[PDB]
Amino acid sequence: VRYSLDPENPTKSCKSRGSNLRVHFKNTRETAQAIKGMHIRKATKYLKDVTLQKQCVPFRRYNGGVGRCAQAKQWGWTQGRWPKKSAEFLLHMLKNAESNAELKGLDVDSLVIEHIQVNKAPKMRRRTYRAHGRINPYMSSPCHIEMILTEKE
Amino acid sequence: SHRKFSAPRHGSLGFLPRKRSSRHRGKVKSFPKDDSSKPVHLTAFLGYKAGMTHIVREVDRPGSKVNKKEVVEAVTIVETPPMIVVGIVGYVETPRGLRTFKTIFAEHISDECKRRFYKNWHKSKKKAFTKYCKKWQDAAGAAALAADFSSMKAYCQVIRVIAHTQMRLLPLRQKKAHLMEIQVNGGTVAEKLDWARERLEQQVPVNQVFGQDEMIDVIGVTKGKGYKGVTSRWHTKKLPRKTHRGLRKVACIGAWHPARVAFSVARAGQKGYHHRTEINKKIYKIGQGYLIKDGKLIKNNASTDYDLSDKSINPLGGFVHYGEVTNDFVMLKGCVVGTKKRVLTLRKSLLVQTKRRALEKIDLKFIDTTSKFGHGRFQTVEEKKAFMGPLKKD
RNA sequence: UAAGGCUAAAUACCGGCACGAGACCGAUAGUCAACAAGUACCGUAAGGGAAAGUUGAAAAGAACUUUGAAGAGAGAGUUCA
RNA sequence: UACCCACCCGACCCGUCUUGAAACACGGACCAAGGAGUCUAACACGUGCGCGAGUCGGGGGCUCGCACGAAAGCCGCCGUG
RNA sequence: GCGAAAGACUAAUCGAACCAUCUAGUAGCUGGUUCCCUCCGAAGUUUCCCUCAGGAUAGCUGGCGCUCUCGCACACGCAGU
RNA sequence: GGUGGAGCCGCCGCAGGUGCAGAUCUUGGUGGUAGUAGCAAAUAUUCAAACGAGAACUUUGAAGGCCGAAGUGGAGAAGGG
RNA sequence: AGCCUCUGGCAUGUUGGAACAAUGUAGGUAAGGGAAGUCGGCAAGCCGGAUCCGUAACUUCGGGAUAAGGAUUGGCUCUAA
RNA sequence: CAUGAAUGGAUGAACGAGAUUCCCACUGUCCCUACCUACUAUCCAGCGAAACCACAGCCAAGGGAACGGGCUUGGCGGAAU
RNA sequence: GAUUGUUCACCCACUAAUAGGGAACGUGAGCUGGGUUUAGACCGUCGUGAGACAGGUUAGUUUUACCCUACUGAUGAUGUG
RNA sequence: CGGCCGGAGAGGCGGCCGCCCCCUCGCCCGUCACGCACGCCGUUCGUGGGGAACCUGGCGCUAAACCAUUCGUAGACGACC
Numbered sequence A: 001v002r003y004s005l006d007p008e009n010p011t012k013s014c015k016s017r018g019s020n021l022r023v024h025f026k027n028t029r030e031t032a033q034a035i036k037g038m039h040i041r042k043a044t045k046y047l048k049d050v051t052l053q054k055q056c057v058p059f060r061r062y063n064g065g066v067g068r069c070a071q072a073k074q075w076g077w078t079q080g081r082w083p084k085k086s087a088e089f090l091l092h093m094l095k096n097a098e099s100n101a102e103l104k105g106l107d108v109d110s111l112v113i114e115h116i117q118v119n120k121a122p123k124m125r126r127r128t129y130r131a132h133g134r135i136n137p138y139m140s141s142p143c144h145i146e147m148i149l150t151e152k153e
Numbered sequence B: 001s002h003r004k005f006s007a008p009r010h011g012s013l014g015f016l017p018r019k020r021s022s023r024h025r026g027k028v029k030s031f032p033k034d035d036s037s038k039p040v041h042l043t044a045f046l047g048y049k050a051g052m053t054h055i056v057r058e059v060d061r062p063g064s065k066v067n068k069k070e071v072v073e074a075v076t077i078v079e080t081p082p083m084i085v086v087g088i089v090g091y092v093e094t095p096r097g098l099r100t101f102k103t104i105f106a107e108h109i110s111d112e113c114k115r116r117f118y119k120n121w122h123k124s125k126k127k128a129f130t131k132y133c134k135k136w137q138d139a140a141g142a143a144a145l146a147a148d149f150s151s152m153k154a155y156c157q158v159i160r161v162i163a164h165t166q167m168r169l170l171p172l173r174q175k176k177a178h179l180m181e182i183q184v185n186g187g188t189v190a191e192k193l194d195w196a197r198e199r200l201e202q203q204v205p206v207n208q209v210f211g212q213d214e215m216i217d218v219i220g221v222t223k224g225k226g227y228k229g230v231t232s233r234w235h236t237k238k239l240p241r242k243t244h245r246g247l248r249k250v251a252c253i254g255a256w257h258p259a260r261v262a263f264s265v266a267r268a269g270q271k272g273y274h275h276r277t278e279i280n281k282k283i284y285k286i287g288q289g290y291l292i293k294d295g296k297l298i299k300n301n302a303s304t305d306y307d308l309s310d311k312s313i314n315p316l317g318g319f320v321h322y323g324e325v326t327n328d329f330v331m332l333k334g335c336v337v338g339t340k341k342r343v344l345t346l347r348k349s350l351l352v353q354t355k356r357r358a359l360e361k362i363d364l365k366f367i368d369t370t371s372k373f374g375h376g377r378f379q380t381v382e383e384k385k386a387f388m389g390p391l392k393k394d
Numbered sequence C: 001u002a003a004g005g006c007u008a009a010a011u012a013c014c015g016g017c018a019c020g021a022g023a024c025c026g027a028u029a030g031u032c033a034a035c036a037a038g039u040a041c042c043g044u045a046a047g048g049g050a051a052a053g054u055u056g057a058a059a060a061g062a063a064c065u066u067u068g069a070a071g072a073g074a075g076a077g078u079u080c081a
Numbered sequence D: 001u002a003c004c005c006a007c008c009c010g011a012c013c014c015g016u017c018u019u020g021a022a023a024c025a026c027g028g029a030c031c032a033a034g035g036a037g038u039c040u041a042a043c044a045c046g047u048g049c050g051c052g053a054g055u056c057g058g059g060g061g062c063u064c065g066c067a068c069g070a071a072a073g074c075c076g077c078c079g080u081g
Numbered sequence E: 001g002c003g004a005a006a007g008a009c010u011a012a013u014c015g016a017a018c019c020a021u022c023u024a025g026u027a028g029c030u031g032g033u034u035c036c037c038u039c040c041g042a043a044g045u046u047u048c049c050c051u052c053a054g055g056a057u058a059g060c061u062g063g064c065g066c067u068c069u070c071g072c073a074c075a076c077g078c079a080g081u
Numbered sequence F: 001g002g003u004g005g006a007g008c009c010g011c012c013g014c015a016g017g018u019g020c021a022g023a024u025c026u027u028g029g030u031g032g033u034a035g036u037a038g039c040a041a042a043u044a045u046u047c048a049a050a051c052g053a054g055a056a057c058u059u060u061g062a063a064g065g066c067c068g069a070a071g072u073g074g075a076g077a078a079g080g081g
Numbered sequence G: 001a002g003c004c005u006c007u008g009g010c011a012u013g014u015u016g017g018a019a020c021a022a023u024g025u026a027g028g029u030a031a032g033g034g035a036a037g038u039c040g041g042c043a044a045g046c047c048g049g050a051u052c053c054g055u056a057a058c059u060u061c062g063g064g065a066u067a068a069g070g071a072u073u074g075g076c077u078c079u080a081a
Numbered sequence H: 001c002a003u004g005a006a007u008g009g010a011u012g013a014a015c016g017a018g019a020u021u022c023c024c025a026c027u028g029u030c031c032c033u034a035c036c037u038a039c040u041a042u043c044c045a046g047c048g049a050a051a052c053c054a055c056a057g058c059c060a061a062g063g064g065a066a067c068g069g070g071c072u073u074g075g076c077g078g079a080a081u
Numbered sequence I: 001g002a003u004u005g006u007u008c009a010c011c012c013a014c015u016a017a018u019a020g021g022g023a024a025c026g027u028g029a030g031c032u033g034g035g036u037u038u039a040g041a042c043c044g045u046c047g048u049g050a051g052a053c054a055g056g057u058u059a060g061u062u063u064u065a066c067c068c069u070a071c072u073g074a075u076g077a078u079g080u081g
Numbered sequence J: 001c002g003g004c005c006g007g008a009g010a011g012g013c014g015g016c017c018g019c020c021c022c023c024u025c026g027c028c029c030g031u032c033a034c035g036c037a038c039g040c041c042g043u044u045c046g047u048g049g050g051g052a053a054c055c056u057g058g059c060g061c062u063a064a065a066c067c068a069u070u071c072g073u074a075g076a077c078g079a080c081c
């Protein structure tokens, strides 16, 4: 399908999208803009340290209640977390795209993640049970992640 | 309506941006007014709180119940090795304040003094003051630091001396020396200055700054205690047992019409680790570290003339939590601010001290040195084998 | 001319069978119901009672290659789209 | 004129009941679709049109299976009223 | 109905159950009441009312007109004087 | 201009279920709150292996533990299907 | 009864990891004073089993009564019955 | 003010999760608080609600529907938490 | 401190003095709930009665903060290459 | 172009001495010339402005900060030693 911001050179640009994935869109958006504009191999390492709690993801827009941390200083923030699922899910998608560029015939080690975007998805439904017999909706918030790697070197 | 039964307020407002202090070494906020007739001296020093102990002395305040009786006084001991002078700094008086003219560091600097320049050391290349030291031997070894002393001689009024501790003589795990500006309350700049030009790269022991039974001020950082409730912080009342939502609070913050809670209401917050300036502490004894002429003059630490043992002020097992004090010290009456190992600043009195309780010359008769790691019962290790004697581990 | 009786036709029909029509509504409208609707579901029970129409013209409904545990993708293909 | 930005002056949040609402009066998170002076009968006056000391209109009747019609036309019925 | 009695309990309901209907019950009382432009423009007073949060009638308002007048060298009439 | 894929409007007349910001309006949808409150009643888990794409949570072994026979054990009634 | 264990049964009762701040909720302990606390001894703690002694006013002569108030209590080796 | 005889008067052993008062004992109820423990809160991975919301959110005084967040005049105002 | 739900009052005792008041008659998402002021009851008076009584008396659920602000602490912020 | 001064309140400016090369310039007069663009506007400078990016030569240069780790003199996390 189409993406927003279709690439400059459709020759040296691979794509990848995921629809209706079970991550939390307020986390996958924060970890998606932190990796934005990096170079692939620098980002694959960064997304593993997000899992090993060696580098954080700075929470800029969705920062309410999010705690301060020490590794937030690199990005010049105060708040930052280590969203592990969010790292794993745009790690497959950063690994799928690394193969679409292989099959298109490109230079894997000169790919720069140039466009990336996370949209809300149709929410799921559950139900929690609350005092005085009320029943609240206990919903999830999935997302459609999509990204376009370019050859920039 | 009014308060039914009046009562004082809890805790002075004269202290109350009660925050974690922004500095660590006690900063002197005012040095004594320099009378330009008395000779040149330093006004401050830099020691380390070690522990406390008992003193026994005779009292001379005639007319009191305890005249010519023996009392016990608790005394801190501030381990205070000789400080080293590294640089001098000039200040000139302005309408807008008191600005700084010209800092001129010596040719050598130190090793411990370099530590205080970079946060991470072993990662760095230790390049600080490696080209300023180059000035001290060439033609420009007269421009930037001989016309400068003449500049600081013409237009300067107040001259402090930058001096750093020796962190290598202490039992402490630290090695980052502590620098501090110590104003020279001498007379006549260019005499105030052609004295520190001399003492560059030089030692300064405690007996130069301070004399015995002199009223000084202690300037350190309170012991830290973290986040604390209104009951510990501002020492309020506890509410009765029945109170539904907590009983360690202040029931009423404020009144309805000033719709802001007031500046002065008691609140939970950080408690401890504030900067405080204790004034009018007395010196009971200036010490002397166990130096060597044949070996180990440990005697001349706690051997007052009236008991003439050979104790060091170090009790058995050293001063708990800190280590053994091995160089000069100053013995202070009562408690000083700070925990063990804390950097303490020692300033001379801004007050003209002429009271009866002050000026009271002191004679120590016995210095307690039994262990503080529990209930010590007997002073020195050889006295231990005068009691029980031969143990099994022999 | 009472105290006994019978009777087709014009007359009435929001149930039923079978039709025809409309200056009517057009999927929150029109019947509750354009669909597996008096169904799902609630209530012990009497009763209550929904939501929900549209790919394309034809399924021609994506073979194959590839990444992935898989969901999902990248190419390819079908199509006037 | 309408998009963004800048400035000087002006400038309180709408609906409502109310002598008086920016009100420490109430309704109002936001956006879509829905949503409130209708029909019938009976008077009254005004106005338009036909005829005019008359004038109808209904119910009937005479003419169709309506396509348009369940219309239109016609009837000492038209005056029984 | 049942109550060693509290108006307790009678399927989360009790100074009088639940279900459907009569039913769109009644409201002098709250709430709302949907496009523009143009012209005119009020009342909170009168008497009567089981009247005092409402009506009835007076006024005040608008719309519709009409009867004339004569600025068409050639005017009577009225008035918060 | 664009996307969209089958119908639509101008004028003269006629007919309306005809114009919404609001009614604690109805139905549906979506925010801010917020990645927040929270996932705190009954003391307790740990090691190794197996299986597996993937193991704090499965399974086996080992160890520590609790329920302690008015049981967290072994069988039934009503109810469930 | 409570407390520990065999037989049998579980895996901390919808999660885990890192810390030991304030407030909390549950538990504990306090020098000297002891109800000065508060509307009130609210809660908590004093007492607590047994054996041996001992027991008031009052009385419906049954009670009060475990009134009150004191003592003793382990382990071991015996003895007597 | 305004008791009183089966609308029962007067008494009263035993009994009372009934209402008071005093004393002994006891005690963190208090002088005056302190520390210790468990579960939280706290931070993290995972998962994730709700009430509420015109617009919103620094003050003094003034006026004003006679106690403003907004208006007048002053005071002042520095991102994200 | 004694009494009192009390404000208010009165006394004891100490002291230098036991001045008087405001802040929505400061202060219930700060407490307590003794008093008022629901439903249970009890007496007195009144009422034929249901019931009434600033006449007494005993028993009677005291919710929600995670939002903005203020405040307290805590990171930071633009500038200074 | 070199040297010596003087100036510190937030100095930021001057001042005063040697040598090289070059020029002859303020006032009156003669003597001619210079796109005379044909009546027309932001002309004339402090301007080698301030800031942001890029093409020549000479001299110098040669890091720290934060994380990770560690420590507790510090701690809710951050932060701090």
Ligand SMILES: [Mg+2]
Binding pocket: A128, A129, A130, A131
């Ligand atoms: Mg629940």
Ligand SMILES: [Mg+2]
Binding pocket: A133
């Ligand atoms: Mg339930």
Ligand SMILES: [Mg+2]
Binding pocket: B002, B003, B006
């Ligand atoms: Mg007072």
Ligand SMILES: [Mg+2]
Binding pocket: B242, B243, B244
């Ligand atoms: Mg309570």
Ligand SMILES: [Mg+2]
Binding pocket: B372, B373, B374
């Ligand atoms: Mg000790």
Ligand SMILES: [Mg+2]
Binding pocket: none
């Ligand atoms: Mg007949």
Ligand SMILES: [Mg+2]
Binding pocket: C027
């Ligand atoms: Mg539909």
Ligand SMILES: [Mg+2]
Binding pocket: C027
């Ligand atoms: Mg539709």
Ligand SMILES: [Mg+2]
Binding pocket: none
């Ligand atoms: Mg329908």
Ligand SMILES: [Mg+2]
Binding pocket: C054
């Ligand atoms: Mg559709």
Ligand SMILES: [Mg+2]
Binding pocket: none
């Ligand atoms: Mg549709």
Ligand SMILES: [Mg+2]
Binding pocket: C081
């Ligand atoms: Mg198309």
Ligand SMILES: [Mg+2]
Binding pocket: none
């Ligand atoms: Mg009014």
Ligand SMILES: [Mg+2]
Binding pocket: D023, D024
């Ligand atoms: Mg007001």
Ligand SMILES: [Mg+2]
Binding pocket: D026
């Ligand atoms: Mg109202």
Ligand SMILES: [Mg+2]
Binding pocket: none
């Ligand atoms: Mg009204």
